[PDB]
Amino acid sequence: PKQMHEDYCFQCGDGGELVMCDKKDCPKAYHLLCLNLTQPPYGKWECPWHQCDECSSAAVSFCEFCPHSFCKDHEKGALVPSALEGRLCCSEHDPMAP
């Protein structure tokens, strides 16, 4: 049945206790340990998918397999299609087995 967030950690892929992103329309959820957070954040928390991993600027292009993402300055050449339905992946993944 329809839920707004995913059932698996976007970082490691395992289930369990997951913090949910507060960014409008973001379905991503994460283990606290995987984000190096000690406690669930107080109040509003937006996940790392929204900020460029190079510079912190707002992301415009998004890895489909992990929270790496890229602003307008850093997005060209950042992602390639993968064997899983052509879904885009960053350099952390083997595109044949992302």
Binding site: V19, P40, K44, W45
Partner: peptide, 6 residues
């Protein structure tokens, strides 16, 4: 921020 359990 909120949590869910799976």
């Amino acid at each position: 921020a909120r949590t869910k359990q799976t």
